[PDB]
Amino acid sequence: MESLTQYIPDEFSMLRFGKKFAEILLKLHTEKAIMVYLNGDLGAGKTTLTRGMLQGIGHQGNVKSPTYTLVEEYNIAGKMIYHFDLYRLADPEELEFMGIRDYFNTDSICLIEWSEKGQGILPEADILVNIDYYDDARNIELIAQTNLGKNIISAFSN
């Protein structure tokens, strides 16, 4: 749908952009879980942007990618946020087993790395975040996939 292209000159800027993006997702206050697919090569900054989003809205503590556990649950001032790294998801099937269930059926926010691995089982994304990189700079394209995605992108305006 609508798109945003945003230059991120350095890591501080990535963290500031995560805080602004996560603040928009909280303020929208949706009943449906917000699906965010974080895309980009290894080292592009998907986990650093996730860190800026969670720490930016108040998480205190390390943001450890869930390499083997696949999903990490956060409770931030009462909002449930789920960070997924699906790289080691053998088959999407394994998803219907683990606790995924309740996470996609409540007023949560889900931030997903390697969403391709979950094709079929994972709910469709509301917004894709495609991160490109050069040295210590980045550029992110946000792409809306749903009506909610469109509303998220419109919120970035001035």
Ligand SMILES: Nc1ncnc2c1ncn2[C@@H]1O[C@H](COP(=O)(O)OP(=O)(O)O)[C@@H](O)[C@H]1O
């Ligand atoms: N502008 C920037 N944005 C994000 N990460 C940056 C930036 N500049 C440098 N980095 C570095 O790049 C790495 C990003 O790694 P990570 O967030 O784990 O990536 P991914 O999850 O996509 O594999 C970190 O070591 C980080 O400090």
Ligand SMILES: [Mg+2]
């Ligand atoms: Mg990738």
Ligand SMILES: [Mg+2]
């Ligand atoms: Mg990562």
Ligand code: NA
């Ligand atoms: Na993804």
